Amino acid sequence: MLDIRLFRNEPDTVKSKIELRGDDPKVVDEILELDEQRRKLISATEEMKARRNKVSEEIALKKRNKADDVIAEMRTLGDDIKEKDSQLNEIDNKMTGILCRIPNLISDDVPQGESDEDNVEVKKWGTPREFSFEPKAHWDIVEELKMADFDRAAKVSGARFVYLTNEGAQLERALMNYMITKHTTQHGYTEMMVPQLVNADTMYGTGQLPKFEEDLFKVEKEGLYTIPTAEVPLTNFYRNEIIQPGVLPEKFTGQSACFRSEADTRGLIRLHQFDKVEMVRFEQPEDSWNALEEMTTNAEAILEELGLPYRRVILCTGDIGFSASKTYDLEVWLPSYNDYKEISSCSNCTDFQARRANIRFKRDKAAKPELAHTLNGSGLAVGRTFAAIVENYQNEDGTVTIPEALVPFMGGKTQISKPV
Amino acid sequence: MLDIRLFRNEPDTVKSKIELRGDDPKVVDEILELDEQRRKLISATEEMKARRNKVSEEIALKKRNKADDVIAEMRTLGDDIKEKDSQLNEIDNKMTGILCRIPNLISDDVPQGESDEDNVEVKKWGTPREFSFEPKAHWDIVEELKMADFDRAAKVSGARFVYLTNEGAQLERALMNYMITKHTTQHGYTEMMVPQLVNADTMYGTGQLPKFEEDLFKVEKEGLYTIPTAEVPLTNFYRNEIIQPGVLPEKFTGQSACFRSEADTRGLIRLHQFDKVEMVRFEQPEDSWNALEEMTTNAEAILEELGLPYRRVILCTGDIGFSASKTYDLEVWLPSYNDYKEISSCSNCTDFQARRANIRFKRDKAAKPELAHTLNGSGLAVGRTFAAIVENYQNEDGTVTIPEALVPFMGGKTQISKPV
Numbered sequence: 001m002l003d004i005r006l007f008r009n010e011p012d013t014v015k016s017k018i019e020l021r022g023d024d025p026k027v028v029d030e031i032l033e034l035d036e037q038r039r040k041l042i043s044a045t046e047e048m049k050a051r052r053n054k055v056s057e058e059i060a061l062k063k064r065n066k067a068d069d070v071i072a073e074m075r076t077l078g079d080d081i082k083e084k085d086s087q088l089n090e091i092d093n094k095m096t097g098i099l100c101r102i103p104n105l106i107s108d109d110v111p112q113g114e115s116d117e118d119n120v121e122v123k124k125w126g127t128p129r130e131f132s133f134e135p136k137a138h139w140d141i142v143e144e145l146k147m148a149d150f151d152r153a154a155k156v157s158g159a160r161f162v163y164l165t166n167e168g169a170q171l172e173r174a175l176m177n178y179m180i181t182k183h184t185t186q187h188g189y190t191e192m193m194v195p196q197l198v199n200a201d202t203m204y205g206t207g208q209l210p211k212f213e214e215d216l217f218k219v220e221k222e223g224l225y226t227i228p229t230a231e232v233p234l235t236n237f238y239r240n241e242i243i244q245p246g247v248l249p250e251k252f253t254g255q256s257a258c259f260r261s262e263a264d265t266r267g268l269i270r271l272h273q274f275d276k277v278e279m280v281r282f283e284q285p286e287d288s289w290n291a292l293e294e295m296t297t298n299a300e301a302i303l304e305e306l307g308l309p310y311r312r313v314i315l316c317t318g319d320i321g322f323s324a325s326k327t328y329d330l331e332v333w334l335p336s337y338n339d340y341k342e343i344s345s346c347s348n349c350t351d352f353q354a355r356r357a358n359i360r361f362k363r364d365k366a367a368k369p370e371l372a373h374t375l376n377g378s379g380l381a382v383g384r385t386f387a388a389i390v391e392n393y394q395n396e397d398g399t400v401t402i403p404e405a406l407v408p409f410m411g412g413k414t415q416i417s418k419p420v
Numbered sequence: 421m422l423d424i425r426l427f428r429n430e431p432d433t434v435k436s437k438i439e440l441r442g443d444d445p446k447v448v449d450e451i452l453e454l455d456e457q458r459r460k461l462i463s464a465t466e467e468m469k470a471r472r473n474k475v476s477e478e479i480a481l482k483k484r485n486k487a488d489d490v491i492a493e494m495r496t497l498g499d500d501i502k503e504k505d506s507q508l509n510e511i512d513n514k515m516t517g518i519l520c521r522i523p524n525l526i527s528d529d530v531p532q533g534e535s536d537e538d539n540v541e542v543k544k545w546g547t548p549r550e551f552s553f554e555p556k557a558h559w560d561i562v563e564e565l566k567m568a569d570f571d572r573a574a575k576v577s578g579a580r581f582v583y584l585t586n587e588g589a590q591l592e593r594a595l596m597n598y599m600i601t602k603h604t605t606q607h608g609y610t611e612m613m614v615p616q617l618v619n620a621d622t623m624y625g626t627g628q629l630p631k632f633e634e635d636l637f638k639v640e641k642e643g644l645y646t647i648p649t650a651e652v653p654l655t656n657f658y659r660n661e662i663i664q665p666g667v668l669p670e671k672f673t674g675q676s677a678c679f680r681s682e683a684d685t686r687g688l689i690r691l692h693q694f695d696k697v698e699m700v701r702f703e704q705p706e707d708s709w710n711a712l713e714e715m716t717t718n719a720e721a722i723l724e725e726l727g728l729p730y731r732r733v734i735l736c737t738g739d740i741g742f743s744a745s746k747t748y749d750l751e752v753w754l755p756s757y758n759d760y761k762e763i764s765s766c767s768n769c770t771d772f773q774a775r776r777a778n779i780r781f782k783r784d785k786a787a788k789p790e791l792a793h794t795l796n797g798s799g800l801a802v803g804r805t806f807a808a809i810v811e812n813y814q815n816e817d818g819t820v821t822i823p824e825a826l827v828p829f830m831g832g833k834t835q836i837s838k839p840v
């Protein structure tokens with residue numbers, strides 16, 4: 001949810017930032033037109049309330065002095081104010097309807113672009129493996145090693161679901177334990193487990209509603225939605241609340257299953273359900289930009305310790321998502337793709353979700369409440385890490401060497417071997 | 421789904437087993453009435469097909485000898501057979517509709533009873549803690565120690581959801597890792613991770629549909645339901661399939677979030693979403709009774725190693741669930757309840773779900789396919805274990821001592837202390 005004051009005070013800047021995203025800047029003129037109508041309605045109600053005060057004083061003065069016309073005028077004024085109050089509620093809801101549909105205003109350093117080809121590479125770590133044999137794609141390895149089953153999951157849930165089996169399920173679990181342990185013991189995040197079903201206010205809070213309802217699984221009877229990411233319940237933990245002095249920064253981490261209706265046919269890259277270890281931060285506004293850097297680094301630490309070559313990019317104006325003001329994506333080397341593939345999205349949402357969800361804070365007991373800033377980042381999407389591991393750690397015999405940091409999380413196992 | 425042959429061959433036994441559950445045995449008479457109508461329809465179609473053969477031979481004989489009446493009779497016979505075929509499809513669907521709604525036939529050793537008071541205690545292990553101070557209930561301890569948050573979860577998901585926080589989330593994770601490690605490394609189960617959203621055929625497969633649809637969260641657009649237990653996708657792994665020779669017994673274990681609409685106001689005992697480490701077995705019919713015993717023992721091993729006093733009961737006829745032929749429940753000592761509280765349900769479903777889901781097997785390559793037996797058991801419901809741990813391991817200062825076997829799963833921590 002955008003600040004109406006920016007439309008009033010810097011409309012050209014707002015038009016520029018909307019246009020840069022590939023969106024229609026004319027919405028700024030539509031908003032200001034409604035704002036002027038709203039301003040006139042309020043101003044006219046105030047002249048009516050003042051007129052009513054004069055009328056009521058006259059009725060009281062005539063009651064003491066010893067209306068019929070001042071009684072009739074009082075009735076008309078009462079009627080007109082009631083009408084103006086309903087008209088104002090309507091214009092407000094109309095303005096809110098438009099405003100909640102506008103993406104977060106991009107930060108100044110977001111580079112201009114039209115597609116993911118215009119995303120700016122800011123860093124590369126590690127060198128893609130140079131194989132002595134033809135590398136197998138992760139979908140073939142997981143079937144050969146009986147780590148995952150797609151066909152049987154299609155039977156029970158339809159396309160783009162999977163069963164993780166034996167060492168496949170063990171590796172998924174080991175990745176989540178490793179990722180959480182890293183973020184909690186080394187990066188100062190507090191572990192959290194969240195509800196996977198949330199109401200519409202929560203989905204609105206983080207920006208998935210109203211625009212992205214069709215990307216979600218909806219439970220119509222109870223009014224719930226499956227979460228597309230732990231970001232949704234993690235950020236909404238402080239919805240409609242004033243965070244207390246001395247609490248910020250609040251750093252949360254945790255795993256959750258993630259559900260996306262998805263309104264990449266082979267494999268783990270795009271499923272309706274996947275696991276992700278999420279990072280969520282609540283920051284003071286002057287701390288959010290450093291927090292984005294620290295958070296992106298926290299996600300890179302997983303790739304680095306897992307020995308997975310990657311690149312960090314800044315999403316261009318045409319590619320950045322709805323709630324972010326600035327996003328870095330981490331893209332992992334995927335031999336089957338012969339390119340880097342997105343494994344994380346780290347964003348600073350500024351005050352966008354905080355305004356939507358009414359997440360405020362106070363610096364001291366006397367301080368005026370302020371909107372917090374919120375950030376979210378994948379640390380990491382588990383299935384895409386699992387995919388990167390099996391492709392990059394595959395052996396010539398078709399086995400998969402367990403990355404060193406995951407060996408103590410795999411009960412001391414060092415290799416994923418072929419079925420007995 | 422029951423075997424129609426038992427209604428034909430032992431109707432009194434079927435009536436007796438239905439009546440013992442508190443159900444109406446008159447359904448056996450309704451089924452046999454439809455079966456007789458069905459038998460007459462088939463028999464009459466067969467006399468018609470035989471008559472048609474005589475008629476067609478006559479038409480061919482008249483065509484060679486040198487229809488109009490045998491042509492007209494042939495048309496009538498064709499019409500009548502088509503009518504009888506639609507009538508048979510209808511009676512079959514009507515019979516299937518009734519049959520799929522009848523619970524599994526109880527085994528002979530299920531004791532007669534009307535409620536959970538008639539469940540027969542078969543064993544007790546450990547002695548309930550004798551406190552030197554008034555024990556706090558788990559809902560107060562989790563709030564005091566900041567291990568769980570109910571109020572904030574009500575904000576995002578409504579009543580009976582929870583956020584597990586800090587050491588609370590760490591303990592939930594440690595319980596799942598410990599439980600899975602135990603079942604896979606000591607009890608011979610294969611680790612599995614499953615889709616949490618399944619279609620209607622899968623929900624029918626394990627018996628939740630059609631009778632218990634209102635206990636589930638339904639995603640109407642995609643035709644999916646959230647799983648109430650990993651039993652649903654785990655048992656359905658082999659739906660519409662013939663398990664190969666030498667494969668049985670198939671033993672699966674895994675955690676999943678579990679979702680129940682629940683059509684115990686304070687705490688972790690009854691939530692819409694909870695975690696559970698499930699055990700599922702596919703057995704040859706002559707192995708399922710021993711498998712129930714072994715599986716119940718596997719669940720008890722968690723309680724025993726965690727130092728949690730419990731009792732094992734056999735559910736009485738009036739208390740046993742829909743798909744089970746025989747169930748043992750494990751009930752853990754809960755100081756706040758001043759009694760044992762169900763923490764696991766271990767069941768032998770015999771061929772009930774296998775018939776519903778068409779789960780078959782072959783003993784050798786030439787063998788005739790047979791229905792497998794399926795079993796499912798909690799090892800354990802995680803939230804109820806978490807609740808039992810905080811109440812039974814609580815200290816006088818309000819801290820919670822970490823049970824010995826969970827210390828290496830808690831990063832070496834030995835106590836859950838009060839907030840810093």
Ligand SMILES: Nc1ncnc2c1ncn2[C@@H]1O[C@H](COS(=O)(=O)NC(=O)[C@@H](N)CO)[C@@H](O)[C@H]1O
Pocket residue numbers: 228229230231260262268269270271272273274276278342343344345346376377378379381383384
């Ligand atoms: N359908 C999907 N299947 C599997 N993984 C996915 C899917 N969609 C996204 N991901 C992974 O999940 C990551 C995070 O998803 S995101 O929409 O980009 N961003 C978020 O969800 C933020 N909350 C940060 O995690 C992506 O970077 C990608 O690696």
Ligand SMILES: Nc1ncnc2c1ncn2[C@@H]1O[C@H](COS(=O)(=O)NC(=O)[C@@H](N)CO)[C@@H](O)[C@H]1O
Pocket residue numbers: 648649650651680682688689690691692693694696698762763764765766796797798799801803804
């Ligand atoms: N609403 C709930 N909230 C929390 N725990 C629950 C809830 N319902 C059941 N449980 C726990 O989950 C266990 C298994 O649930 S069950 O319906 O009895 N049986 C099954 O689900 C079988 N698949 C065996 O696990 C119960 O024994 C109980 O300890």
Ligand SMILES: [Mg+2]
Pocket residue numbers: 342345
């Ligand atoms: Mg993305």
Ligand SMILES: [Mg+2]
Pocket residue numbers: 762765
């Ligand atoms: Mg039960």
